[PDB]
Write a protein that binds this ligand. Structure first.
Ligand code: HEM
Ligand code: HEM
Ligand SMILES: CNCc1cccc(-c2cc(F)cc(CCc3cc(C)cc(N)n3)c2)c1
Ligand SMILES: CNCc1cccc(-c2cc(F)cc(CCc3cc(C)cc(N)n3)c2)c1
Ligand SMILES: C[C@H](O)[C@H](O)[C@H]1CNc2nc(N)[nH]c(=O)c2N1
Ligand SMILES: C[C@H](O)[C@H](O)[C@H]1CNc2nc(N)[nH]c(=O)c2N1
Ligand SMILES: [Zn+2]
Lengths: 409, 413
């Protein structure tokens, strides 16, 4: 059936037909909704239907459905799955599939940009040194001296599961975190375990508060190897405040490039277990989550101190006051250093415009309200009031197990 | 469905295990292929439909009092069954009415305030016959719940539906709301959300004072008759002028709000019976007023004027002038209620209490249905503990349900 979504602020109603194409499960049933669950729970036989469906939508996207080129490709893919148990995507199909995995990512508020994505084909890579080279080229290209450009680098697909290419880092650029003897934590507390794995593999930690972690890269199922990204490639922004001159004395900085490297890219039934992709930051990712999550840098206390706020009762809203000032400083700093960043008001505005575009030309837009609404000031952004339907379209980005739980050394 | 479902808290690593979802009754709106978890809204019962719905509720009640299978349990089952047989409906005992109402709150997946669910004063108004009598019952509710600012949660329950043509209804969506007036030039005075209901009241005879904060009259329908207008005595309507602990100019905005949030358009379902007029009230979380009532673009929409008096740069969104003013507005609301000793709860305290409640319910009851989209506050979401808490949403009965607005369905006499 046709489903309607209403915006309760503007009363705009949209009609979704695109959900009729979905396949993968959401995790919900008619009796239980799992919309706030973060992770809800091949062979020649399963592979050809998936390949067929993807080729079908590719040749439908370039308006040659049923053409001779379409027919030949379908035959070509069938023979190749027969004789090799897999198949290789054409360049054009790889690019189309990577763009549509982004387009279909229901949890991404930045998808108005989906068709502007630089795709780096790294399927000829065979070693961790080669992965390192490809990743350095990605970082330099995407950083572009602060004028960030979206990019993805795609390493060889999975074959038997025993020869997986993996980036062990969850993101290409992250700060280390160290367990202190006295119990507390220096650096980024989320990364304490991964930092420990790097140390155990030979990394010499500077034991500072903003130590860029090395890359830990696994090619063809072999043991992973360490590499230091050249520092001139890692763009950083010292965080200061436009009115509070003491804010710079907090000593805070962050990196310019957000680059997810632990997800799996699925295209036509093929699985690309190493596909680092990067864009640019929304300010709240750093200012709310990275800095103010209790289990992260957790700086609200210190900032509220320097603002001299009354911190004895929660109803003074001292946490909310310090949170806003921190996020002002983040946006001010990136902007002053001409490093691409988007605030949550502008980003959610763009996303509403994007939904409008997608309903018009595509018949829908899968969207996960739980992830789309920003982690602060929710209802004064327009996505808060926008009903969204969430469903799974392929090509897709998926979660996968952490490599240190599966790898045999 | 599987027997055990797990939810994780991503901040604390606590894992909880839910088995109560096996008792879920109606539908969520979601399917295997689509999730409707952010959709706001995704004739009578026959003798055959009513029998099992009543047995399920009676079984649950007698289980709750540790008398499942007792002689009083089997006798009550037989009495209910005979009564459905001869009359096509049945009447709840007072004990069962109170149990049912408290559990409809306990089961209300969108309510963050449920740690209080067992402390609800239930007013049995099933003997009411006229709109004047409904007015009396509602006035007593308001006075009891307000308690001079020491608010007490309460529900008043009017006669259940019979054939669907004799419904009791409070036409107001909430017992206390401010009027809104559309101007010829397109501007609105008062609360823009209430223009439609205000016009109905005016048509029915209400003489509107045409101010910014005019308490609307009650519009009360008894036994399916045409609704009738009544003015709530103003001394029963407790109000708080909003001032700011630092900004002396904030009082010059002339803002105020009423102390008592009382939802009156929902339907209470107990054992298959339908209570179409069941006004219930608690106390406010500050953000309901400071974020939604005052700062929604389609409501009072004061962010601009507050930002002006704060002398913020309003030319770029990246200055976060909106966020800065939103916090100060919510500081003022909490400060003004606390100063006047009117019960209110901030979003930090309320979500912390909800986590403790949910954990206790998981341990004692086997689960706690919760709608994350509604539980997470409309500001500063991720610095409250519920943001990081995975939730399962499902529908347990007794329950509160939405129902059609009565002006869309009423057959005028
Ligand atoms: C161009 C600017 C972009 C912006 C402003 C943006 C914004 C965001 C934000 C704020 C999130 C939530 C992240 C979190 O809370 O962890 C997100 C998630 C996500 N983004 Fe985008 N993004 C951008 C580019 C991209 C690109 C280039 C891709 C892939 C090609 C992508 C795919 C995704 C996916 C798959 C998620 C879900 C991640 C997860 O489930 O952990 N995004 N995005
Ligand atoms: C005692 C203090 C209470 C607090 C602090 C509280 C808090 C809240 C809040 C913040 C909401 C969201 C409201 C909105 O965004 O419109 C809500 C919704 C709700 N509450 Fe509670 N509540 C309380 C008492 C009650 C009581 C006494 C009942 C019923 C007996 C109740 C049943 C509900 C229901 C059914 C909803 C869903 C409303 C809807 O869908 O429109 N609550 N509550
Ligand atoms: C489910 N959260 C997992 C988690 C926990 C802690 C940190 C992170 C995380 C760390 C990073 F360095 C970077 C990110 C990128 C998120 C992201 C990705 C893209 C393409 C654009 C954007 N604008 N943003 C996410 C992710
Ligand atoms: C989907 N929102 C519908 C909507 C829209 C605009 C206003 C309202 C609304 C108006 C009011 F006077 C009062 C409320 C109270 C909601 C509520 C109820 C209770 C028992 C405790 C509490 N703390 N809060 C809600 C509701
Ligand atoms: C579209 C979305 O479902 C809608 O805006 C919801 C979001 N969450 C909410 N949460 C609460 N408490 N109250 C609301 O009115 C809403 N509105
Ligand atoms: C439990 C809940 O699903 C979890 O905390 C989610 C909520 N929404 C989110 N939204 C974004 N953008 N990022 C997140 O990490 C989360 N975490
Ligand atoms: Zn769902």
């Amino acid at each position: 059936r046709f489903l309607k979504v209403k915006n309760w602020e503007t009363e705009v109603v949209l009609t979704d037909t695109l959900h009729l194409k979905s396949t993968l499960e959401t995790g919900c049933t008619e009796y239980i909704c799992m919309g706030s669950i973060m992770h809800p729970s091949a062979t020649k036989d399963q592979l050809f239907p998936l390949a067929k469906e993807f080729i079908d939508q590719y040749y439908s996207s370039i308006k040659r459905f049923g053409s001779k080129a379409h027919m030949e490709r379908l035959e070509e893919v069938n023979k190749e799955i027969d004789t090799t148990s897999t198949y290789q995507l054409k360049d054009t199909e790889l690019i189309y599939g990577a763009k549509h995995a982004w387009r279909n990512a229901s949890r991404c508020v930045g998808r108005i940009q989906w068709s502007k994505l630089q795709v780096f084909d790294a399927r000829d890579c065979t070693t961790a040194h080669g992965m390192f080279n490809y990743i350095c080229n990605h970082v330099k290209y995407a950083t572009n001296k602060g004028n960030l450009r979206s990019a993805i680098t795609i390493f060889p697909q999975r074959t038997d599961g025993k020869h997986d290419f993996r980036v062990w880092n969850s993101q290409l650029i992250r700060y280390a975190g160290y367990k202190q003897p006295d119990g507390s934590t220096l650096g980024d507390p989320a990364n304490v375990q991964f930092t420990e794995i790097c140390i155990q593999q030979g990394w010499k930690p500077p034991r500072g508060r903003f130590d860029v972690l090395p890359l830990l890269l696994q090619a063809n199922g072999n043991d992973p190897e360490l590499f230091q990204i050249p520092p001139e490639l890692v763009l950083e922004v010292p965080i200061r405040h436009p009115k509070f001159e003491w804010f710079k004395d907090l000593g805070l900085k962050w990196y310019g490039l957000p680059a997810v490297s632990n997800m799996l890219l699925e295209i036509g039934g093929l699985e690309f277990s190493a596909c680092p992709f990067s864009g640019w930051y929304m300010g709240t990712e750093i200012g709310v989550r990275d800095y103010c999550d209790n289990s992260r840098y957790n700086i609200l206390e210190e900032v509220a101190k320097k603002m001299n706020l009354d911190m004895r009762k929660t109803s003074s809203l001292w946490k909310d006051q310090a949170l806003v000032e921190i996020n002002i400083a983040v946006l001010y700093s990136f902007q002053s250093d001409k490093v691409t960043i988007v605030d949550h008001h502008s980003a959610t505005e763009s996303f509403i415009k994007h939904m409008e575009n997608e309903y018009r030309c595509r018949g829908g837009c899968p969207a996960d309200w739980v992830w789309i609404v920003p982690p602060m000031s929710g209802s004064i952004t327009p996505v808060f009031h926008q009903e969204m339907l969430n469903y799974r379209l392929t090509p897709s980005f998926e979660y996968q197990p952490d490599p240190w739980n599966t790898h045999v050394w």
